[PDB]
Subunit: 246 residues, 6 copies
């Protein structure tokens, strides 16, 4: 039996996130093990989806699915999409199998067995499949009148994995590979999380890396801040989703 | 067995709405049949409510009930109300039996057996019972300070039915009857849907009509756009719902 | 059997709130009785939470828990917190046991056996435990650009109880005790409700008191108005919840 | 303000039901008023459905809809069906618009403006539309082996209304009319509730009537007992719902 | 960053429970700390309720509230009741504030700061307040006919706490105090859990104690087995909850 | 616009299933297309899970995950498991990522791009990974006393796909391949569904095949019957999931 004294606010905050990080590591590694490293099934993104949905403000929705645009083009299948449903309609889909208008998307994340060159490249491919889609923006009626259309922001993209393959972790080889992957704005990976205890992002332009027990809390609060900086999705042009129909 | 090749984004969008249109047609026509054309019970609006709730952005709530104002006046029973709950309180009601402050209302729709003169007139009567109610508007605290009260918008009103009775569909006789019904701003019917495959609206001032497989997707996206143009409900004056109480 | 004629809108509004007031009185008094006036357990705040959650606009969340700040400091256990989750993250908690960032808080209420001097003082102590916590505010990206940080508002605090102990109700002795308790901005009690049928608030600076069947509807609409005047919580500085972590 | 002392268990039980009875009376009478006695819309059964769903054991499901049998025959639209979903499949319907296999049904109730001869006859017609449908019963695999098919029970049927029209309440004229209506096993009305404060049933063969504040609690506990006596629905013959399909 | 290899089934089972044990320890100890050892509020039982609800088979319901019998008698306020809702009605209550018929109860648990003599005695007092209530049992209609009434079983009772106060844990002093408390069948404590890592039960008549990382999984599986041995609650006599009403 | 007359019960039953079959075909084929025939992601089983969960009686639970036994052994990742939660505990998992005791399992289904030899073999491999796991069975307390342990039944296994690859559909080549796959009781595929419009099963020992619009309704009702014949899962031995723990 553990000797328990008292728990203070800082300690409880750390534990509330680190124990969830350990739970995610256990679940995602079970899935990686059972699927033989993603070769006999996809790593099960569901518990990651649940945790990020629980954390994120309710202005954000979180699910897996496919992104579509008003030109009829589709992304690849995306493991985790962070998107708007407060202002943007739902295309008569349901939880676990979304078909999302590109205008609604804030961020996308791919869940892979490990952070390595191969899987960074795959996650960047998924990102590009979303960022290549066309997005509309229209005027906005509000308390102060009608605002001009909001400029689109770059969609945030990342990778979530069980661990980091390089022996030195997220080190020089990692940053060189990330710099090379992110040599195309459609392919940029802004952030990533390994639930064994590492995270990175380029939100401040320079690559910032964290390791250890607080990786999840760092990843989530830093992502919160990046999302904050984006504002709300622009107003979808409803005309363009019906203009080719008879 | 059907020969299935591949499904593209445009095709999936069309099917996702047209198959729901067919499902609604089947359900609403069952209800029309069982009730002997609305004479032994009301056409069951519940599946329509579910579909429009699923489609609409989450800033909108959808339910059946009664609308009330700060003068104690009530509308008739309304089959489908699109309304705000993000800023406007709930009068201790529950799903399926709402008692809604008039300030919260964006739109109302009546579900009837068919689109014909009699049922257009009934749907216009229901609309007028809502539009006659009194609505308040107060100042709005926001990030930029306090905005002056927002001007009210006209509530949108429409009809949903199984089919269209005129042999020529939504044709010259229809537009003349709609023009005559909508000769009173309280009675105007802005839009309508027959799930057999027709829709209309006057959102662009002229009457625009669509028929066939895409009626539902047209109706929903055009309604989305009309709603977009309205902004958010004005801020309710909380004083007027308690000013006659001791 | 009661003779029932008809029900009008004003009458239904009054009943919809007064019958809920009677239900709350019955439940809270059962809890007060079973716990021997709070001495063998806390008065069960759950049904109060349900009613205020049902009434309040969906921009507000309602639950019990603990408030924490970016300095690691905690409030006492709070019976009812009205707070934001639309813009502010959730610290991986669940319903009934929240751990809430101080920036999210609009109001706090303590549930006690009765309104008397002792319990007013306890409710003021709980309020101060929340108001002493540190709150951040950052710039706000929005359709019109980026707004400067929003100034914090004073958190609203109150007391909910079964009845009022003074024989004269909320009278001269009450207002003197409330004036003395509220001689410290951190300890101010802005409002209160006794479900036997009394309420008070200082929203208009002078103390306004109501008694009888409409106490609940007065309390809720007046609180709605006070909340309205506050706007939305300022934007949390995400940096300060991770700045002490390695 | 009301003087509140203490609440004991018996008192809380009575209040928990009588206050809900008053709430239902208020809601159903609002609906009766707004619809002009059922002539401009159906009385809204939704709050009744919610209360009986809340009370009844979870082996029972409660909703509105249509009952269908394996011969393709349908009942009329039914305001409240008490039915099984634990052993009996759902025909891909949703809440508020059920399409229920006759084998699943325990009881049906019709909601009308008042208890009078006309509305008793209508409620009996609805009952007969359900009881005329064909029901199957097959062997039952269980811990002790396989049981022979269970014999069907008579479906329970009743009426729910706002009040009772006869000046003498549920008196001699009522019992004579109920005796005449229930002169056909398909048309029998086993029970009824007027939320103004009356109930009746023939569960003990003789007609038993209650009036006043405890009408709802009597109706619900007596119905519970009648349901108890029926056991679980027999096992549906899955073959008969697909035997006419190619 | 942690080195992660693979996760096997046994390892994942252990982690899935031990990490939840650590989470509960963190939460319950926060609550114990904030409330100053239960003296400024009750330890928050909500997260315990969530975990046991999640684990237990769906034949069991779990909540806090008060137990009542057909004689109008009430228990004290109970932190966690495991009870039936599949066969036994709900007395128009809601989650977090149940008013439960004694016939429905399988088990009760009290949440306290620590396992010590004082808190064992308090948990035994709570148990006795439930076990003293009167329970009915009636015949049971089922596929094989009608069974005679089922004999009542003893309600299971226990204690949940953060840790164990004795320096030697659940040792000789503990077993002597538990033996003395459990010298009255109404006061018997069958089991207990300290989330720091200890559990006990007398399910096999002798006291069996476990310590360490697997305390939660032991407690839950052993409780599952004890519950299994009880069968389903007997059939409530519906007559006795209405026999004193007019 | 379609000419709509009336809808009868048989017609509505057929449409309610066939339109859902068309919806599933559209969704699953979108997923097959976007994933390049399962090579760039798994076919999204989520909408299939939703439909079968909606249809099946509530004694059955439906989800994806991994099956585990009391020996610590795991199945492969399973796309759809039909299992018990009414009597069998949940191993602290959540929807979309279940970790299921083998004793709880009634059936398993694998979702693949098409019915062909390769994918039949893969679905049989998944089945065997579940059927190889160890299952316990203990005595059962019930109204009639204590029953001896229930004998285990063979788990049902199948395949769900978009279409059938053989030009002749489910013909001679299919039945020979199914006969060869099912030459090992652990590998037997009892049933399958192609949402383009074919289904098969061996529930009656001989292979029965259906094609066309009614494939889904046939598959679901025939599966219902097969499940019916199995009874309820045996009672899990709670001891064996904790016997290797210290
Ligand atoms: Ca287009
Ligand atoms: Ca993946
Ligand atoms: Ca007024
Ligand atoms: Ca209607
Ligand atoms: Ca800090
Ligand atoms: Ca309190
Ligand atoms: Ca048939
Ligand atoms: Ca009716
Ligand atoms: Ca009694
Ligand atoms: Ca306690
Ligand atoms: Ca074992
Ligand atoms: Ca698959």
């Amino acid at each position: 039996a553990k000797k328990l004294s008292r728990i203070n606010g800082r300690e409880f905050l750390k534990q509330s996130f680190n124990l969830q990080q350990q739970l995610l590591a256990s679940q995602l590694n079970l899935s990686r093990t059972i699927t033989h490293d993603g070769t006999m099934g996809e790593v099960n993104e569901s518990y990651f989806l649940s945790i990020i949905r629980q954390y994120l403000p309710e202005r954000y929705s979180v699910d897996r699915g496919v992104v579509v645009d008003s030109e009829g083009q589709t992304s690849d299948q995306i493991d985790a999409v962070i998107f708007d449903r407060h202002y943007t309609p739902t295309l008569l889909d349901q939880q676990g199998h979304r078909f999302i208008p590109a205008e609604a998307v804030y961020a996308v994340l791919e869940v892979k067995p490990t952070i390595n060159k191969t899987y960074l490249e795959y996650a960047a491919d998924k990102a590009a499949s979303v960022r290549k889609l066309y997005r509309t923006s229209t005027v906005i009626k509000n308390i102060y009148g009608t605002a001009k259309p909001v400029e689109h922001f770059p969609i945030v993209a990342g990778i979530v994995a069980i661990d980091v393959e390089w022996q030195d972790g997220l080190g020089k080889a990692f940053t060189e590979n990330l710099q090379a992957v992110s040599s195309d704005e459609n392919r940029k990976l802004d952030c990533g999380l390994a639930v064994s205890g590492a995270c990175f992002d380029s939100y401040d332009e320079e690559i910032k890396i964290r390791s250890g027990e607080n990786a999840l809390i760092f990843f989530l609060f830093r992502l919160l801040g990046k999302l904050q900086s984006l504002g709300t999705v622009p107003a979808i042009d409803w005309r363009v989703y019906i203009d080719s129909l008879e």
